[PDB]
Amino acid sequence: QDKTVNWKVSLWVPPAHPLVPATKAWAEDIQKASGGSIRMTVFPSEQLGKAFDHYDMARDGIADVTYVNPGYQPGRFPIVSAGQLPFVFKDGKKGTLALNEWYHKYAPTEMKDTKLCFAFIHDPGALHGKKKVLLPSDLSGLKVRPAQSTIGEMVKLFGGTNVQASAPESRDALERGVADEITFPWGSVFLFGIDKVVKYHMDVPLYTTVFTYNIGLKAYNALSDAQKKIIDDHCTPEWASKVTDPWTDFEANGRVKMKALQDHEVYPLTDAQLAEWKKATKPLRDSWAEQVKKSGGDPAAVESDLQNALKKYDAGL
Ligand SMILES: O=C(O)Cc1ccc(O)cc1
Numbered sequence: 001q002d003k004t005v006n007w008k009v010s011l012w013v014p015p016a017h018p019l020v021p022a023t024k025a026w027a028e029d030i031q032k033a034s035g036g037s038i039r040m041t042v043f044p045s046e047q048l049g050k051a052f053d054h055y056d057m058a059r060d061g062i063a064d065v066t067y068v069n070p071g072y073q074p075g076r077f078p079i080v081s082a083g084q085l086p087f088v089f090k091d092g093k094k095g096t097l098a099l100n101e102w103y104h105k106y107a108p109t110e111m112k113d114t115k116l117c118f119a120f121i122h123d124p125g126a127l128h129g130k131k132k133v134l135l136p137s138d139l140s141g142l143k144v145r146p147a148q149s150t151i152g153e154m155v156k157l158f159g160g161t162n163v164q165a166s167a168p169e170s171r172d173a174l175e176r177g178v179a180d181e182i183t184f185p186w187g188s189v190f191l192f193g194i195d196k197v198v199k200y201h202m203d204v205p206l207y208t209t210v211f212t213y214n215i216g217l218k219a220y221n222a223l224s225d226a227q228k229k230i231i232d233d234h235c236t237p238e239w240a241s242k243v244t245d246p247w248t249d250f251e252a253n254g255r256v257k258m259k260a261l262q263d264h265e266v267y268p269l270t271d272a273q274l275a276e277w278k279k280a281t282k283p284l285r286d287s288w289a290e291q292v293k294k295s296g297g298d299p300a301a302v303e304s305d306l307q308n309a310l311k312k313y314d315a316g317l
Pocket of ligand 1: 013185188
């Protein structure tokens, strides 16, 4: 038998979040593959550290595996931020596979101080809140809790202000009144109790959040070659889908559930209103491209690679 391995996996979502049982099942299959030599415990609810610090927790050995939202740290990961632009993805499952295939090309530039396991997205989210927002300018003067740095840029472009908060901190920000509006996926509105705090919901696949699962290099490099192979075999597109597809399904189910509640107003946009949003969100691409160039990348090449992946997987809106 190999030297026994005991890993800690850190998440910043609660136990009822679909990623938690799915990640336990991933760990269980690794234990089965390794004949017991690799064991893990999954720590939800920020027990091991705050949401925003999860990349550094993997980098620095606080946890062996972490769930990361790169977009909680503005400017840190300019390439992966291409997936954060409004109106990119139509579907969580195919979008996860497209993002993962594309980003594995660039993760060695941008995430070289961890091992990237896989990248993924959520089912496209929506704008939820206390006001019936139809056009970009309706965010002017509103306080918005953005999902990631690109949505934060969008809020400022439209004359709102941001409320920086992680998913588990968002209900409290809305309840205290410091946020009027939130970009969130639909099932998570229920999971975090936000359905009791906001009643308006714009029925548009506005954006998604990009995520990574990151493994510490010291943790990985302490494995035997047989153990490394088992981890690598659990970091493939197959496993990106197995871990994240239940989350996609949960979030899409949330939208259908919300649309049946008589105390909520889930409203469509007109073609004219949606075009103002598509047209109005376009400047975010130049901001993205400038950040990539400043960090030493070629945004035209990075963007064409992502567009090719979207087309391959039929993942693009
Ligand atoms: O909007 C975010 O903060 C990202 C996110 C939202 C809901 C969720 O369940 C997980 C992450």
